[PDB]
Amino acid sequence: ISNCVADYSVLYNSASFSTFKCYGVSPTKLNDLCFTNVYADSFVIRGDE
């Protein structure tokens, strides 16, 4: 992901999701920062895993 305007609040407010955990950052601050070397991983696993 590169050279763009990201609006994470749509993602975390409009919850289609069951897990949303951020790690070295808080979800509230994500619309205030700028980012470097953004990447997205994606796969499918079992529910217990």
């Binding site: 975390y12 407010n13 409009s14 919850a15 949303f20 979800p27 509230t28």
Partner: protein, 47 residues
């Protein structure tokens, strides 16, 4: 049910019901599908 906690995002916690950070008290939950089912359209929330 995740969002009823101190310091948490979502839009239950952001648009509907917000706990403070210095919260003293308890939070109790239990599922109620036998009493809250059919097609039930009597439970609104804000978007």
């Amino acid at each position: 049910v995740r969002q009823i906690a101190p310091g948490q995002t979502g839009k239950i916690a952001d648009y509907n019901y917000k706990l403070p950070d210095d919260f003293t008290g308890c939070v109790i939950a239990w599922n109620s599908n036998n009493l809250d089912s059919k097609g039930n359209y009597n439970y609104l929330y804000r978007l």
